[PDB]
């Protein structure tokens, strides 16, 4: 669906703007962490590309990524907000309803990206694995990973990316 492609374009640009604004990001900022390899196990027509919008302050990055995702979702027709709990369950093993999604994605991000296995991961080059992705035949679903330069920040990006690629099914 084109609800997909134009919504990920909206959210990939809300991310970018908010990181610049709230975290003083730039594409001319030497990243601490670098997205190395990018791997789709079962790829049925998706391209993932990485975009560098790095910055020092990783909690600024987490809140900026929360703000973008709050908005983008709240900017959904109630009919298409209806489909979001199903993506939650399929990607994060979490149960939710439309009125609950914001607090529940919220509470998952800071549990998961404040955990010690994320915050204390200081390995420079980090890869991203997604299980599956489908695109329209002649229309590749084009996704963008926004590398924030931190491990705490990419953790929130990747979770969005997990929900998104599950939407393509």
């Amino acid at each position, epitope marked *: 669906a084109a609800s997909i492609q134009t919504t990920v374009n909206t959210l990939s640009e809300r991310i970018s703007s908010k990181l610049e604004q709230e975290a*003083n990001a*730039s*594409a*001319q*900022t*030497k990243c*601490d*962490i670098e997205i190395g390899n990018f791997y789709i196990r079962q790829n049925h027509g998706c391209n993932i590309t990485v975009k560098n919008m790095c*910055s*020092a*302050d*990783a*909690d*600024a990055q987490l809140d900026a990524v929360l703000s973008a995702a709050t908005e983008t979702y709240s900017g959904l027709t109630p009919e298409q907000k209806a489909y979001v709990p199903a993506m939650f369950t399929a990607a994060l093993n979490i149960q939710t309803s439309v009125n609950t999604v914001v607090r529940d994605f919220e509470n998952y991000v800071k549990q998961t990206c404040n955990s010690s296995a994320v*915050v*204390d991961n*200081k390995l*420079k080059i980090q890869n991203v694995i997604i299980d599956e992705c489908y695109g329209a035949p002649g229309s590749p679903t084009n996704l963008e990973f926004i590398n924030t330069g*931190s*491990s*705490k920040g990419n953790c929130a990006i990747k979770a969005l990316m997990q929900l998104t690629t599950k939407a393509t099914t």
Partner: antibody
Amino acid sequence: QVQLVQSGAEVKKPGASVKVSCKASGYIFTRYWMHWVRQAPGQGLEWMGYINPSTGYTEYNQKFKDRVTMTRDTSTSTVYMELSSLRSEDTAVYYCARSDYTNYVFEYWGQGTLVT
Amino acid sequence: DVVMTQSPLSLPVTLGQPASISCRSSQSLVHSNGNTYLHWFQQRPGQSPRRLIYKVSNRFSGVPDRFSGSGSGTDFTLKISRVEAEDVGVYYCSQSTHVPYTFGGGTKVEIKR
């Protein structure tokens, strides 16, 4: 107005360890990277590495990959630096520097710390 | 690694006259992103470093316009148009394109007599 306070001079015996430090002031700590440069007596500068204070990420010069351990303290705005196994050549001044917003230029230097 | 060579090592300069210092690199310093990450610093005698020029030509806040920088690729030049007694000192060039960041060996500027 940005300000970088460093600890005073030191004299260690060959093979031991020392810890310099670097209290900061005047800017949001976690928003800027902190470097560390050493200058031998009557010698040019030499880059040791940096630290991100929001996260702890570090990146050392290989010359001291096993001997330096840059550290932070989000509460006291203080960036430490421990050189272990001090040799005779390790005697020098040690400045800490703040970065711009791209981690590409040194915008604020400290004052110095002569360790010998 | 990137080796920076500064030349000359010593520069007696008549008060009020121009002056030029040179910096060469063992590898090009033009980054993929378009910028060249070369910079100059002044060290007043025994004091600590003091900012000067960044990215070949731009000057930090509170930096006299007599200071000025130029060059391209792998050979760069700094120029003090008129040399006041406060400009005595060692000038260092640095690069930050290639980790680790590296500095040249310095040039000493002194008034001539």
